[model samples]
Target chain A: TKQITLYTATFSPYAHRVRIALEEAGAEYTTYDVDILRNMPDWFPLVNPLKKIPAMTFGGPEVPPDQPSPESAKIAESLAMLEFIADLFPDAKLLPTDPVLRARARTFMALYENYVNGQFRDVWFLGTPADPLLQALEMLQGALPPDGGFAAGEWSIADAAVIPFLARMFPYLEAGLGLYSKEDGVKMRKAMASERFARIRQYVRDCRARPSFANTWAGDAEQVEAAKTVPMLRVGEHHHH
Target chain B: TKQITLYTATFSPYAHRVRIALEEAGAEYTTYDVDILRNMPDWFPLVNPLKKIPAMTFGGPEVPPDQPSPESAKIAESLAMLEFIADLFPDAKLLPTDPVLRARARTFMALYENYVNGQFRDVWFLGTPADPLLQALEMLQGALPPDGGFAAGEWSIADAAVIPFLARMFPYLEAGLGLYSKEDGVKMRKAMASERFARIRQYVRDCRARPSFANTWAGDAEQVEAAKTVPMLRVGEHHHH
Candidate 1:
């Protein structure tokens, strides 16, 4: 069996996505946490030239993550890693077998990446209006099966791709941790709990209930604490712009 | 056999991506061009609720492309469709069998979508600076194998995902299209033809040589003419901002 090493950060949902997929695949892998926001290691760039977390090395001489092997295949980008994990562990059925269902899984991930992810980043990091974020969430929610199942009607990698951001939304809002105004925070909390987001709320609950999510995620309070270390969240700062 | 129909537009690189893949797959598919910008059909929303080009209907009753059947699986998003084509036609080997090589394909697609696509859109549509676009192109070129090949050593969906934009860049510049300044246009033309971008230039030429690209693409002059029909290109107009 090939060795897999994941370079990760506690605060990065992008990294968490890969972690969940690996856990679901039941792959024995090592995760080395890098302080990406505060003090990234000098050798980090060797692991990922882009210097992004969720970078991985596949099949090389076993060495500490800090001393990445030239023989290892360095992999970057979270979604790419998700698909890689699926391909590596086929029996895990990380994606559905049917072509259409597989398309659904891919579509759901693209919808989030293309449309919804930016809204979350802008609202949390840049303190943009929350209305657009909420609207985008509704569009994403409509994509899920109304009869209660995963994005592709089975627990697929698409769920792993999205849950990190949705899971963060609740605790971060509860803690008032983002750059958004207090009024927007309150508005988001009410909207998330309301019937408008019932499907997504249930979707989050279902995803978190899985052992894969449970194993990979740091508990909410701990994750919130870790996120506070991120310079961009600006936990207590008011938005002047 | 299930029916496949692609709602396309002559001007859309997004639509072109799927068409190339379909041609590669040798799938029996029908294409119906939609005037997305100037005259979208009222019934188009039935096919793609988002009303985006490159919408596909799979496995429904055979019907006219204009009257999409609800029984069909309506797949939206260009990259997702590319993957769907790969999934549906496995014998075509649209992606590599090796996990590492597959990751390379996925990563290449993600790299283009996340980084390069935005720069192209901004420079062409919004008259943004050309330096960022050129830099992003160089970063993308670095992802290719130095010895020369497709994005992942063979032509994969990754190539399908990217060639549309890169293929358009040269002719668009030659035709003096886009919202970018005349100086910026000249700068891009030189940069694209220079030693710095030699790999990408070869990449474009290699991809264009493929029958997949040739069948789907109108010739350079024809494509430039089609792009002019797009309201955003504003062929004869100058950017005010």
Candidate 2:
């Protein structure tokens, strides 16, 4: 028997990473959308001390009657949730078994955290200027392998972690609001056009085609437009999990 | 025969994390210093496409004569390097073998990158003000186990990853040069002294006593002083590997 529940927001790319994993793994799970702007579920804090989205409850599902409801074996942190699902559903092969290759994938995912997620958050939302976003893209370009493919040799955890952010980037560049419309964003768009980024360009296309991506962003256009009014998203402020 | 070499800079907390692992594992590896500001070794870029510190080379060390050298089975990116070194030296017990706990440890480390490292980078070097730093400390305080100490039960890669950053926080708060001297930094100092952070206080102390932390930061005082002028650190820039 398998029981998995995901706590997520409509727009959190961080949570989106785990959803990709869940979809790829084909694990039967429930999706609980946390209306981040609304009063959070009373038990949300118990399951996730950080109270961040993409928090999960796996395995035995039993909410103590007197205690807290839906606290069923909670695991908060998106990276951990990804691994938990991967390990639980070994057939999915979400990550490489070889330690060396696994490390390579993990490192690539870390780059997404340090560069992609943080940089975009700063540029598009926080209004922190946009030079770092371009630099991050440049670094990503440098890390891409020849033939312009996946983070590892094949799609793995790294890709799942990153694809969500890439999906957001297109919207930001196209929207051309705040930082993306500026010279820095113009430079970023140019970089994407370069030969060096050929692989990343292809990877983004390939990832978009995956069922996981399509499902996660099923109503993405509307959701993205709706998120425009989110105070945290508008201000580009920090939203910790 | 074992072959391992780490590419590092003295003041880089990123490299220091890996150094802690190397020390704990007692892994025999030569250290090659890269003066990041000065002319970087021409070969550095080849080994690490991102040209960041804590890149490493392992196994069957023989640089192709035609190559500029130091390119022996190269592996860059600290998370990958940590896992590589840990896999090589299982006796070190650098990471938990149990998959669930391992995921927990990894998630915690990700928190460190997102909250601890990024906020400090913003406040101290990036001129972004300092409230985020205090907020990070508070979040860290919340995630930290109440029993007081250790990121994952015993000292593991998570601890190694975090100790270096904690060491840096004290110096920045003491210096109080930019944002720290303001109301926010004062608030941070107050928070640190409170009961809520008592566990983190113990954690910082315990981590300091570890050989990994000791050997890595043996020359920390001088190195920290010298790092005050490092361009990358100075600019509050993005450095991804």
Candidate 3:
């Protein structure tokens, strides 16, 4: 088995995605948290030129995370890391066996990435209107099976790809941890709790109920605390007003 | 084998992505072009609720494109379609066999989707600054193998995913097709032609040289004509000044 080292940061949902996948795969992997926001190490670029967290190195001679070996394959991008974990552990069935089902998983992930992710980024980081973010979440909620199920009707990497953000939403809102105005935060919190988002709430519950999610997640309060450290969130700026 | 039908539109690079992958998979499938920009049919949403092209239907009784059966699985999103095609036609090896190599393909696609696609969309449709688009293209080019191979070192779906956009860029610029200003267009053309973009130039050529691209593409002039039909391009409005 090849060694896998994941460069992670607690504040990053991107890195959190891969951790969920690796946990679901029952993998033997090392995680080295990088202070990507403030003090990213000089050698970090050698592992990921983009200097982003969630970078992975595979099949190299065992070495400390600080000193990545050149012999290994350095992989970047979180979704790619999910697929890689799936590929490496076929028995885990990180994705479904059926082509159509697999397509569902891939489509759900894309739907989140392309449609929903930006809304989260904009609303939290830029304090853009929360209405668009709510609408996007509704669209994502509509994709899920109405009765009950994960994104693809079974546990898959698609869930891993999305749960980090969704899990953070409630806790972060409760703690008032983002750049969004208090008015917008209240609106989002109300919308998320209402019957309109019942499906997604249950979806989040189901995903969080999984051992993989439970193990990888830093708990609600701890996550909110970690998010406070993120420079972009402007943790207390909105509340001071 | 299940029946496969792709709802496509010539003007859309997203739809073109699937067409390329389908061709690469040597798939036997029907493609029905939709007049998405001007007159999208009401039933089009049945195939894709998003009302986007590159929607697909699989495993249903043979029927006309207009009468998509509920028995069939309706799959949306271009990248999802690419992965679906790969899943269906594993023998075709639409992706690489090795896990690391496969991660490369996935990462390349993600890089293009996350970073480059938005730049293209903004510059072409919104006429945002061209500098950011060129910079994004440079970042993308850096991902390609230095010796001039496809994005993942072979003609995988990553190439299929990207070539549609890159192929459009040169001709679209040459024809002065996008909403970007003439000055920005000239700047982009120069940057693309200069030594800095030599790697991406060869990448476009290598992708275009493939039969999949040849068959799926409507050619530069025809594609330009098709794109002219797109209302978003605001064909002659940019030239009035």
Candidate 4:
């Protein structure tokens, strides 16, 4: 097997998925830490250019494939890369094999990324629970089988995606600042708590349950909570950047 | 193969993409025309409660083994479904195979969908091409390769996703509104003039060249133009939705 190295940031939901996929697939790969908030590496610009992380490098050890050469693939977007990884390592079978069914997996994943994640921004970043946001969530519920189950059953990529987003949405969901109504959030979470999100939450509980998520996460809850106290990074600095 | 179906409206870019991908992939599908101008079908909700066009059904004559049951795969988002189509049919390869390269494709598509498409609505609809409008164009350009070429090459689904928006923007490009200079527009257009886009643009040309677009979609342009040629779709009248 060629060496596979995943460049990641601690506690990022995006990075965690690739880590999990590599783990679940039993694909052996070394991990490299990338501190994206500080000075982004010059080589990262060459690798992702977009500077988003959880990027994968294959066929090499720690080194990115030479760029300006069209042959090597250096993928940036997290979900797309995860899907590609599933494709290359079919032995892992992370995605369903049938074409239409695979499309179903991707469609649900995109909904999680574009629509559900769209609401996450409104509820989390914007700090207001808008109707457009809430209604979209209700629609996601409707997107479920009227009976409801795994987004793709048997734990596919969409399941990984939708749940991490829910993890990210924890504050908002608990505080009633997200797209769900009280009863709905409760029902949804309880249902999800047992199902698709169970694995995801377990991932978090495992990580957080470990000493690392907090101890190694670079800041304490007070710092994290206080930072969220005001949505602005700093009022004056806001206009500066 | 059970029974593959696409729910669509003739005029919607969102719907058009599914149609194109189905034809492009040579996938067998029974397209149920959804008249968005108030004749939406009752069963549409069973597919997408959003009742949006291009909601699709997967499966052929029988349940393909290893797939989630036939009823579970009706995905709502257009590009999501398109990505699903590309994934399902490898021979068509609507997107590139490598994850990172596909990221460039998806990110460019996402930039167009969220940033450029969203802002275009504000400029054309809101009757203002202010700072946000410029920021959107900058972001759109940000998605392109700095050296300037296809987001990938030969017009994959990335172009399919973007060209409709470009077709929408083409009129504004000519109006001398100073939002996007003709030079920028031409650079963008010449880029679009590539053989891959020739197919989609040819589709647009035929659509626009039609009496309906001339009479209808053109009227949409004229109405907005008279109303100061706002940057995006004006609310309550003309919207991308």
Candidate whose lDDT is highest? 1
List clash counts for every candidate, in order.
Answer: 0, 5, 0, 22
Q: Give the TM-score of candidate 1.
A: 0.98
* lDDT digits (tens) for residues B43-126 of candidate 3: 999999998887899988899999889889999888999999999999999999999899999999989998899999989888
The candidate with the higher DockQ, 2 or 3, is 3
Q: Rank all candidate structures by their lDDT, best first, as comma-separated numbers.
A: 1, 3, 2, 4
lDDT (10s digit) by residue, model 1, range B1-241: 9999999988899999999999999999999999989999999999999988989999889999988899999998999999999999999999999999999999999999999999999999989999999999999999999899999998999999999999999999998899998889889999998999999999999999999988988889999999999998887965633
RMSD of 4: 8.2
lDDT of 2 by residue, A1-241 (tens): 6467787787678788898998998888778777656567776776677767767776564543223355356677787777677777888888777766777787787777766777777767656656667678767756667675578776787888888888777665665543334566666777777885676788889888879888988465665675575565543333221
Inter-residue clash pairs, candidate 3? none
lDDT of 3: 0.91
* Candidate 1 residue spans exceeding 4 A from truth: none
Worst 10 residues of 3 chain B by lDDT: B232-241
Candidate 2's C-alpha runs over 4 A off are A63-71, A126-135, A171-179, A182-197, A219-241, B60-71, B126-132, B171-179, B182-196, B219-241
Best by DockQ: 3
Give me the candidate number with maximum TM-score.
Answer: 1
- lDDT per model, in order? 0.93, 0.71, 0.91, 0.56
Candidate 4 residue A104 Cα shift, in angstroms, is 2.7
The residue-by-residue lDDT of candidate 4 on B1-241, one tens digit each, is 5466777554465665566666667677676666544555555566676666667766534432223244555666887777777876779777777655666677667657655676665545444434465556555655565543556644467766765555555554554443443344455555455653444455455444533233223344663353342223322342222
Looking at candidate 3, what is the lDDT of residue A86? Answer: 98
User: Candidate 1 chain A: worst 10 consecutive residues by lDDT?
Assistant: A232-241
